[PDB]
């Protein structure tokens, strides 16, 4: 799916742009700066009307 592709690309680039860590629960956790942000891709689609 196009949404799935956007999700995978966003996750991969988030993995690339951050530093790796291990949390208290054991889930792999990425530490990233507050001042740097990523906006997810939108695409196009049809919009419902009143």
């Amino acid at each position: 799916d196009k949404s799935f592709r956007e999700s995978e690309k966003f996750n991969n680039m988030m993995l690339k742009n951050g530093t790796k860590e291990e949390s208290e629960n054991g889930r792999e956790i990425i530490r990233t700066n507050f001042n740097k942000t990523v906006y997810a891709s939108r695409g196009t689609g049809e919009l419902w009307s009143p």
Binding site: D1, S3, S7, F10, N11, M14, L15, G18, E21, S23, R27, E28, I29, I30, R31, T32, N33, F34, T37, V38, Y39, A40, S41, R42, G43, G45, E46, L47, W48, P50
Partner: protein, 797 residues
């Protein structure tokens, strides 16, 4: 078929048909195919209240009216057996049947409606061949055919047969493919809700009202008009609503006057006060009758969140990628933040945090979203204040705090001001004239006080005259917009309602947002402030208390009652619970914690702290402030037409009130809560009439419904089950949430009244009965001479 025949089954017998006064139709009294008689069915479905008997019937062509006062609402009247034999006197339920009079004993007074059916002597039952000859009709067709009398008055069973479109609205989804699907799924429900709220409010035109004129402190004319108690109680009006007060007649030409409400009917006055906006046309202060008030419906509540959905579905820079892909519910690897943790979580000169709230504060500063679930009395307010203050100190940015309730926003703003941060309160334009405890934090107050130069002269001219020139008005709006922008840019935190985030004045995108008691609001109401460019959203709320009241019934069925907090928890988010309570006695605490909280909740207060010494109240077990006083009365119908009330529970509650008063408890420590509104009303006038001691000492007691008493606490609270019917039907109390929100209101002592037999069928009330009985609290009889009640509570398998 004769005109006298029933409109539902067509029975021609005049000993069973009865004429409705409002719609001029005849109705039978049988229960064929329905749980109730048809006449009351039509009365409640069409709001009708007045009925007239057949001329040929045993009583004759008469209209059922009250003897003493003359009311015509059939739901009130009832027969009283006069002391003289074979004499029947018509009296309404109140105050005629309760004001003692020597000409008849009122203790045998019975409602004209029993078991949802009129009395046989007033209207006899049809004979069996007459029943078999009448056409059968199920309640489904009853409601369907009733639905179209409001449009055409000639509809019959074969007339309509209408396949009106009833499009199956798509049920809400958990994980949407994109923002477009989310918007498409949500839209229709919101359209229906807006349309029907507008429909209901616009139908409340108040006509031929007697208006009394007066001058307020700000030189604004006050239009104070009195209304009937039934209409005023049915009026769902808040302080600050806007309507049109227009008069049309010979005495004075057509006029239109708009303004807000600054006072509402209460226990002291039943006067609606209308502060009129200053207008070029002066109000006719010489007029007192003939005025008509029409409420100005406003779709701004819905259009704003429509704009919010537009922003979510269109703008890329509306929401950060992580919170976007979490709101859509898509799988995303967990993300942390590079923020230095504070040395000590607790703040000096303020509340000291325990381990649980320390965990809550610690785990919240590192993640972009999390959910905090707070049992009542724990004090979520201090946790929210600490989180806001520490995040603001960490990032030094503008912070947004929102909550569906205006009083809750006021409380959080006062608390945040107690921390020394800079707090600005965004008051609604209609609410700008409404006083509050944080009125000094009002943004309008801020611009008015911090006005300088031309701005003072413009504000003074606007206040003195009321209206300005077009050029002056444009300078004024531009300059106040400039000042507001400076204030907001200078302000550390911004206070606005969850619906106030749709205002255009909040043009600036906000990054740090606190949403408080999110469950109390629906999902769009919490999505309003989240699409304004935020990267860290923190949601506070508890999903075991009352949430959103959705008037639309298809919307509530489809899922509009499911708040964002509930959806996120259902997604897989595990909240952080605070496991200590500081309000109610451990005996008062053992049940709700065990049933709703899995027993994990712990008591932060001791038994002695929640124990009043030398208490002379006859509790069944000394040391256990909880009892179940069983009453075997029968429930009735109030003047509304859909509520219920019980007189036996009213007298018993008044007795308990007096008994607690002789124990020394002040009225401010005792309140009464009733799950039904008409019961609350009856309790109110019964207390104000039959007060054994001074009536003032009773009127100071606050009485309100369960839903209107959410988020508050009292030393003593009395619970009334009311429901007492032969069919053992309880109604809307089947949800455990309503029971949960009710018990925790009381700090020291809890008193429960009602009929244990009706409640015994419900499993939840069955376990409440088990817990009350096993602790030696299930009693019966007079409070002075309480013995245990031995009704069989366990159903024999």
């Amino acid at each position: 078929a004769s005109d006298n025949s029933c409109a539902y089954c067509g029975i021609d017998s005049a000993k069973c048909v009865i004429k409705c006064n409002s719609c001029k139709k005849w109705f039978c009294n049988t229960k064929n195919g329905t749980s109730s008689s048809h006449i009351v069915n039509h009365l409640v479905l069409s709001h009708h209240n007045v009925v007239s008997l057949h001329p040929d019937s045993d009583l004759g062509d008469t209209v059922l009216e009250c003897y003493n006062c003359g009311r015509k609402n059939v739901f009130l009247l009832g027969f009283v057996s006069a002391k003289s034999e074979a004499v029947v006197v018509l009296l309404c339920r109140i105050p005629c049947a309760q004001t003692k009079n020597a000409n008849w004993d009122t203790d045998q007074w019975q409602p004209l409606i029993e078991d949802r059916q009129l009395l046989s002597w007033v209207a006899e039952q049809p004979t069996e061949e007459e029943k078999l000859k009448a056409r059968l009709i199920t309640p489904s067709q009853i409601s369907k055919l009733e639905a179209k009398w409001r449009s055409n008055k000639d509809a019959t069973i074969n007339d309509i047969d209408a396949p009106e479109e009833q499009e199956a609205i798509p049920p809400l989804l958990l994980r949407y493919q994109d923002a477009y699907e989310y918007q498409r799924s949500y839209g229709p429900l919101i359209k229906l809700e807006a349309d029907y709220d507008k429909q209901l409010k616009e139908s409340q035109a108040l006509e031929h009202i007697s208006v009394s004129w007066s001058l307020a402190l700000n030189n604004r004319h006050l239009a104070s008009f009195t209304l009937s108690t039934f209409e005023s109680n049915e009026l769902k009006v808040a302080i600050g609503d806007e309507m049109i007060l227009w008069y049309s007649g010979m005495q004075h030409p057509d006029w239109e006057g708009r303004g807000y409400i600054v006072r509402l009917p209460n226990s002291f006055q039943d006067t609606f006060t209308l502060e009129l906006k200053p207008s070029k046309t002066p109000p006719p202060t010489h007029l007192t009758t003939g005025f008509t008030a029409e409420f100005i419906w406003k779709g701004t509540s819905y259009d704003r969140m429509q704009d919010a959905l537009k922003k979510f579905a269109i703008d890329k820079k509306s929401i950060s990628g992580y919170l976007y892909y979490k709101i859509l519910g898509h799988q995303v690897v967990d993300i942390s933040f590079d923020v230095p943790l504070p040395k000590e979580f607790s703040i000096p000169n303020f509340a000291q945090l325990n381990s649980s709230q320390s965990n809550a504060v610690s785990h919240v500063l590192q993640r972009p979203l999390s959910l905090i679930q707070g049992p009542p009395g724990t004090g979520k307010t201090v946790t929210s204040a600490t989180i806001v203050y520490h995040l603001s100190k960490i990032h030094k940015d503008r912070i947004l705090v929102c909550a569906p309730s205006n009083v809750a926003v006021d409380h959080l703003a006062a608390k945040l001001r107690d921390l020394g941060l800079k707090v600005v309160r965004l008051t609604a334009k209609s609410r700008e004239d409404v006083e509050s405890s944080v009125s000094n934090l009002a943004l309008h107050n801020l611009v008015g006080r911090g006005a300088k130069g031309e701005l003072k002269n413009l504000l003074k001219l606007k206040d003195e005259v009321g209206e300005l020139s077009a050029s002056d008005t444009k300078r004024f709006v531009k300059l106040v917009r400039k000042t507001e922008a400076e204030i907001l840019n200078k302000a550390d935190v911004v206070c606005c309602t969850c619906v106030g985030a749709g205002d255009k004045r909040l043009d600036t995108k906000f990054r740090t947002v606190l949403i408080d008691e999110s469950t109390q609001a629906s999902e769009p109401e919490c999505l309003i402030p989240i699409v304004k460019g935020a990267k860290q959203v923190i949601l506070v709320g508890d999903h075991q208390q009352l949430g959103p009241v959705i008037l639309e019934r298809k919307a509530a069925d489809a899922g509009l009652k499911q708040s964002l907090f509930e959806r996120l928890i259902s997604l897989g988010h595990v909240p952080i619970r605070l496991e200590v309570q500081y309000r109610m006695n451990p005996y008062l605490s053992e049940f709700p914690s065990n049933m709703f909280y899995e027993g994990s909740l712990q008591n932060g207060v001791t038994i002695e702290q929640r124990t009043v010494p030398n208490s002379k109240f006859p509790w069944p077990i000394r040391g256990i402030p909880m009892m179940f006083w069983a009453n075997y009365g029968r429930e009735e119908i109030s003047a509304n037409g859909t509520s219920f009330l019980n007189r036996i529970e009213a007298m018993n509650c008044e007795r308990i009130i007096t008994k607690l008063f002789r124990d020394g408890v002040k009225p401010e420590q005792i309140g009464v809560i009733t799950p039904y509104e008409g019961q609350r009303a009856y309790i109110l006038q019964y207390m104000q009439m039959n007060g054994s001691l001074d009536k003032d000492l009773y009127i100071k007691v606050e009485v309100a419904s369960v839903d209107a008493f959410q988020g508050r606490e009292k030393d003593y609270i009395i619970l009334s089950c009311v429901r007492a019917n032969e069919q053992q039907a309880i109604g809307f109390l089947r949800d455990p949430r309503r029971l949960n929100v009710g018990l925790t209101r009381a700090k020291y002592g809890l008193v429960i009244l009602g009929n244990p037999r009706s409640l015994a069928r419900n499993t939840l009330w069955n376990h409440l009965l088990i817990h009350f009985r096993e602790k030696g609290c299930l009693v019966e009889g007079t409070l002075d001479n309480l013995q245990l009640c031995t009704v069989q509570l366990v159903r024999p398998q």
